[PDB]
Nucleic acid binder design. Structure first.
Ligand SMILES: O=c1[nH]c(=O)n([C@H]2C[C@H](O)[C@@H](COP(=O)(O)OP(=O)(O)OP(=O)(O)O)O2)cc1-c1cc2ccccc2o1
Ligand SMILES: [Mg+2]
Ligand SMILES: [Mg+2]
Ligand SMILES: [Mg+2]
Length: 540
DNA sequence: GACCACGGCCAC
DNA sequence: AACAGTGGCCGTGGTC
């Protein structure tokens, strides 16, 4: 940890390493070091020294394991003090912040990162002695999960590049037509992408009324909620919303994604961040593949670009009404449990209410609208906003929210119990004991307290569902290798797999069973599954 | 070139 | 916009 011994290190040492850049699939490995006892080992040539390691044990283990897979080396991740910190407090999200909480410094030298990994592991493992529930989540979920994510990251997903490039041009021509239509209505040209320029045109030059203001700077907002509020008080607004949709999808997905294909795989490689969220969810970045478009007809065209290798099929599995089922288990609502022990669909039921139509005539776009509504209401939405999203008088929306919860009395009782317990203990917890600390529950400004309250009772629900999915991933991944299949993506309550066409149907059937039986609840988990040549087909 | 705050908006 | 929650990436506008 200050003293130096010749490479290689002894078995079980802690590793540090420096990458030329944050993405492991794209990084040059600039330095590799390892630490054990009172000694640090430094490698003369980093790529060769990788061959010597049996596992990756230390800070950001998964990242080094991914780079090793890229080179054809099986170097699974083992212990990672970031995972210990994240289980102790999920505000622990980066090495910089962990080190300056638990007794070190994160620099840019591999040998220091290795010596830091050594101490940070000893400190945090000691803080976890006696937290049997957190130790369980570390050994049975997070640590084995890191290996699953490393393989997902190194495998990647195939993308139809020539398609997206052709699509970029069709979208550009439609963007330019819309720009010209707005310029004409404004009587002049300007930067439609400049929020501040648009504000002035809409609210000063034209007379349009300003419905709301931005948070930090108090400017007149031009957000969709504001604009759609007057989608007919001027047609220009209508075109602006269509321009925004198109430019958003072009600059975020259509244009950048094609330029991210890796030269040695032919595929697109995301990163699955395991200590990035306050609830236990994963996140995805560089690029985010958890927010690929899907809701609009153009977003659908984009999602179709995600395709199976030649000779394989994509398999898509998605839990049914997942947080609603979890809520049933957590709250013990007899009436809510029943709903699911009878195969009812509350998303479909709210849509039938919303659109005045029998359950037989709800289509997939209707039910999507009802999902946002049902979860909006659930987690604390206000009567006022609902009346505005649903386009109905204030008093009509007040009432749905009343009936929504009368249905299931035990829910509000579980909310209040969770908060009281969170006020007493400092934190709220998932079914498996994952914690989120929420101090503001006893803040003296109502607005701050009530926000903390909404964050606080959402966490056990969203975080239990994430625990279940993570555990499902951990159980499923060994069965996929034995069938010659691959795990490609996770989108919170959804998995995408890639399987040989000859094994696709068996793989689907199997993955569904594992997901549904991951951890029986007081309510059955149902999983929808589809198979197709592309990401969209598989979700149908 | 690198970093940042902000408004805004995609997904779950 | 807002008494829904959880993320990450865009362009703009700005500094060093
Ligand atoms: O606005 C939201 N707020 C929120 O907190 N979530 C959470 C809660 C859900 O259980 C979980 C998984 O989401 P999801 O798989 O899409 O939905 P569900 O599992 O409940 O239902 P199903 O699979 O169709 O049967 O994500 C989702 C949405 C939402 C709204 C929407 C509209 C379109 C497409 C997806 C959507 O997602
Ligand atoms: Mg679902
Ligand atoms: Mg889903
Ligand atoms: Mg730069």
């Amino acid at each position: 940890a200050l003293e130096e011994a010749p490479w290689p290190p002894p078995e079980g040492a802690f590793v540090g390493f420096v990458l030329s850049r944050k993405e492991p699939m794209w990084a040059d490995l600039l330095a590799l070091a390892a630490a054990r006892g009172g000694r640090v080992h430094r490698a003369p040539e980093p790529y060769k020294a990788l061959r010597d390691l049996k596992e990756a044990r230390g800070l950001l283990a998964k990242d080094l394991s991914v780079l090793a897979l890229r080179e054809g080396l099986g170097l699974p991740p083992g212990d990672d003090p970031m995972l210990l910190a994240y289980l102790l407090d999920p505000s622990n999200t980066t090495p910089e912040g962990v080190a300056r909480r638990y007794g070190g410094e994160w620099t840019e030298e591999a040998g220091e990162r290795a010596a830091l990994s050594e101490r940070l592991f000893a400190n945090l493992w000691g803080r976890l002695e006696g937290e049997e529930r957190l130790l369980w989540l570390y050994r049975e979920v997070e640590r084995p999960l890191s290996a699953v994510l490393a393989h997902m990251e190194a495998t990647g997903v195939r993308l139809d590049v020539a398609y997206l490039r052709a699509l970029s041009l069709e979208v550009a021509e439609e963007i330019a037509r819309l720009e010209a239509e707005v310029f004409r209505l404004a009587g002049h040209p300007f930067n439609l992408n400049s929020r501040d320029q648009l504000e002035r045109v809409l609210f000063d030059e034209l007379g349009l009324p300003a419905i709301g203001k931005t948070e930090k700077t108090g400017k007149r907002s031009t957000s969709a909620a504001v604009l759609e509020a007057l989608r007919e008080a001027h047609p220009i607004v209508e075109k602006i919303l269509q321009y925004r949709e198109l430019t958003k999808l072009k600059s975020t997905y259509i244009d950048p994604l094609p330029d991210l294909i890796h030269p040695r795989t032919g595929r697109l490689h995301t990163r699955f961040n395991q200590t990035a969220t306050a609830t236990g969810r994963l996140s995805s970045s560089d690029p985010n593949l958890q927010n690929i478009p899907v809701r609009t007809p153009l977003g659908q065209r984009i999602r179709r670009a995600f395709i199976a290798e030649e000779g394989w099929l994509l398999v898509a599995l998605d839990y049914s009404q997942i947080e609603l089922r979890v809520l049933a288990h957590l709250s013990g609502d007899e009436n809510l449990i029943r709903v699911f022990q009878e195969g009812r669909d509350i998303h479909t039921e709210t849509a039938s209410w919303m659109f005045g139509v029998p359950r037989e005539a709800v289509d997939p776009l209707m039910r999507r609208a009802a999902k946002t509504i049902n979860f909006g209401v659930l987690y604390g939405m206000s009567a006022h906003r609902l009346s505005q999203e649903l386009a109905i008088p204030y008093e009509e929306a007040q009432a749905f929210i009343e009936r929504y919860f009368q249905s299931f009395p035990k829910v509000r009782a579980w909310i209040e119990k969770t908060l009281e317990e969170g006020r007493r203990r400092g934190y709220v917890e998932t079914l498996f004991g994952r914690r989120r600390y929420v101090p503001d529950l006893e803040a003296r400004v109502k607005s701050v307290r009530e926000a903390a309250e909404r964050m606080a009772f959402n966490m056990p629900v969203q975080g239990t569902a994430a625990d279940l999915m993570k555990l499902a991933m951990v159980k499923l991944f060994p069965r996929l290798e034995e069938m010659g299949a691959r795990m490609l993506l996770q989108v919170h309550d959804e998995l995408v797999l890639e399987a040989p066409k000859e094994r696709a149907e068996a793989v689907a059937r199997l993955a569904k069973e594992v997901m549904e039986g991951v951890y029986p609840l007081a309510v059955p988990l149902e999983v929808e599954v589809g198979i197709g040549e592309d990401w969209l087909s598989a979700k149908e």
